[model samples]
Target: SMSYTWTGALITPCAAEESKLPINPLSNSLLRHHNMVYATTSRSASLRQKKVTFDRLQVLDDHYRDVLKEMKAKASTVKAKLLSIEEACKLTPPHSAKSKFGYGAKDVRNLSSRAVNHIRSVWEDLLEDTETPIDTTIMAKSEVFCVQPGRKPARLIVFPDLGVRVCEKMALYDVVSTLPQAVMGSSYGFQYSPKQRVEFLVNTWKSKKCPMGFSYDTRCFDSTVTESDIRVEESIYQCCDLAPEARQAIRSLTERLYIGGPLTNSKGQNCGYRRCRASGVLTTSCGNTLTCYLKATAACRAAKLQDCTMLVNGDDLVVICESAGTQEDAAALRAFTEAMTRYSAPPGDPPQPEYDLELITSCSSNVSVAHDASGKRVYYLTRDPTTPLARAAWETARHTPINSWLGNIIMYAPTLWARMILMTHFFSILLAQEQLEKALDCQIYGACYSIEPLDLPQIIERLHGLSAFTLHSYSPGEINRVASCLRKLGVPPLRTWRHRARSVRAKLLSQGGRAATCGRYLFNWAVRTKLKLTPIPAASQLDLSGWFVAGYSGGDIYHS
Candidate 1:
């Protein structure tokens, strides 16, 4: 029987900066949304991912509650401004949605006294059981994270071990681009193109097939997509975007998981009125959920050709071998063949047999540590970046008292000190790689941040000592390709593996309605194989050339 499957999101944005738009109301916030599917290759039917989503959901709810609490403070301050002690005493917000239905803001404020008499009177005649909450005597303290993620695997699995974390596996591309952009230069990250992602399934994700070897093809090119942008900047700012705090909580939730949302209004139309179709890895929602198959496909494909842009068609499929050649190897090949046949639809139906990404890693404290070759291990961990979080706090502070930026534990400090503390605490998770187990076991704690766009100069000035950043330029065709990719996106989809996802429109209507597909082919011709501008690294530096496997690495990431 087939084992497991997960979901994906695929899009081609027409504009890079605008990629964050067009997402549904539920996931418009980049930090708050951007769904991914991190599942297991092995799973039974009748499984619901809710229990697992609790951790992520809790994070979103935590931010929601924090927003409520902060809003309450604003309420109290307003009472103070009115010189009303009576109003201040009665200013309290409800904690649950069920009890919070009072519509007018003025109708719900209540710090009125708690009453045993009223409680008894209301519950008299019937067996109406409203349990009075009471804590057991002799309370002891236990540590709990404000937000909890899903269960941790006994060990760490790097890229789709059991199909677990498929969402993360597929999102490798966006992760690399966005995270590297957070700081100045890049750290030589990975991307998930269709070619490299598939191999892991044969070997890593299915450790039982450990020696089940796999292979893919690659080629070098001699040309590059030389392009540039001359579009005028659109005011260089935005409003109505989520505050940074909400952004962080959402990002952390999605980093290791996935979110599903909208790309347009309730009319079922898209924001930019664009769409496309894709297949051959796993099915993806035009822009909703994602599946683990595409994730594995992207990762495996990326691992191969170091400099290849994901080509929609006209690419070769390399074979995978579970073991050495023999009847068993034949059997393994047959298994894959059977698997493909079992799910690939007849005539008009869509394919099935989707499996979650698997995990096969041990986040050991020391490399010296070893696991019994006989035992099973997996890795499960993820978090959001800080850029989004800071923006949330900034917005909250902007409308509230100047000192309302941080929570209670930090309020005792003076204004400047609080600012420093929040920045440090929020930015703490930026580039550090904690041992997966450490994050899982609570040994390593971190705060999530919300991100929002800032102008090049404003970003530099605001985050001055907080982070290191740089700006790089891309050629005209390359810029077109990138912009088209971004425009295809609204907000990042809920899951990268979402199969229902439509292919991004290759032709952007802008730029005199020039076709984005034109840039795609030109990318092969000008940017991928070779580039006109060569980076010159100082000998004192680490040649750095090895790091820039792709031209963009050297141009956009390193030298930039």
Candidate 2:
């Protein structure tokens, strides 16, 4: 009730008190620098922001324009906050950092203009001493990716009330940044849940270290997503607080980088699978392309974890390949496992654990076992069978009008095939809604069968130079349809603001890489032109796999 007041402290001097002392002005105890920057007190937080001046108006204007653009987008937004220029205006002799260029905890909690006015009043009062004449020369711009400190409760939850802003940044290891869904959907498969990632991040901050928690890259983490996972979300918070010490994992990361949830071991559930008929027919209603990839990422993670040696058997032709070519690298692990097993059984003259290049890729042009993995059954050990969904897809083949396939020696009645096909489609839809069993995890592997049932298996076997090869029998229409769908999908990798804003764009923006955006209408397709495409490898073409020639972005998106 009775206490002294801070009548005329300098703005900078007041910062120490504001930070060191809590809100109770009488106590003479201010919040710390860390706490003061992100304090959500509606009354006075804004007084601290430096306002924009005409000289550097362009940069500041860009910041505002960008922020407003996001606000205008009802369903879309950018990662940012609004900073006041008042602080800069008040500097006795402005610092480059304090001027237009600034760095500090970002202000994420947006405030109303009225509220901002009140905060500005007190701030302007504090800056009375440094009312220098207006100057213009430099433009202050945001230097680093800013992150607003997140506010949280006593406990953390997976689906917290917050939206997409509460993400874990490589920078906020010591701070409790609530993980949000958009970019930071708790990828459980890669490691722990979102809350866990935050807890781990904060713990590092406390110990004055970063756990560099050995973790993620998204799909790997998200495969563990299940309805029941939410019920256990709070447990992560408890665990983080309970843990006594940080893992010192950050020490391992010589340089900081962002990674997604685990890829190799996310399990095949998230791995793309092709659902088609063995009769070479395409399902009429399916809108997307089928995709495939190996679940061998686990082989890499396990090898790294176990310090296992990886021997790359050049003779094995085990180059990493992908139907989707989802930017994964399992070569480190593939090589390690081969080397680790060397003492027990190493690849010698003929290659001991010889497996086909198929282990590295489910489907791709020029994908062959090469010289080493040929004629060896050991490859099956590295790869697993397709999931039940894929099997069901296989059995669904006969429903098409044409039942008598070229190799149908023991054939079902065409009517029977028709019924089976129709039934499986219905079954697939319903099963898609069923809850995933966590124990099953997600299928880490993915495959896109051409669904073309040609006598190509023999050609494939021969090309592979193997006595035997495991080829799923697919029908022709199925192959063409899937190929058509994939080719179509290839057209939109660069499309809109939504696509451009994604972290993927920055990653693929290199020359001969991603461009502006997916053209609204990519290209109208015509007939096939295998002759021209033969000159260029398919993977680089982006419409197919492993047939890359570097410069063919979406040229293959059209027909020859």
Name the candidate that leads on TM-score.
1
Q: Determine which window of 10 residues in candidate 2 has minimal summed lDDT.
A: 284-293
Cα lDDT of model 2 by residue, 338-432, tens digit: 43232112222222221222222211111111112122321111111111212222222212221122112011101112112212222222224
Candidate 2 whole-model C-alpha lDDT, 0 to 1 = 0.19
Please report, in order, the local distance difference test score of every candidate based on alpha carbons: 0.20, 0.19
Residue-wise C-alpha lDDT for candidate 1, range 355-392, written one tens digit per residue: 22221111110001111113322121111212223333
Local lDDT at 503 for model 2: 27
Candidate 2 has a TM-score of 0.17
Q: Candidate 1 — which residues are off by over 4 angstroms? A: 1-248, 251-258, 264-327, 337-559
Give the range where candidate 1 is weakest over 10 consecutive residues by summed lDDT. Answer: 221-230
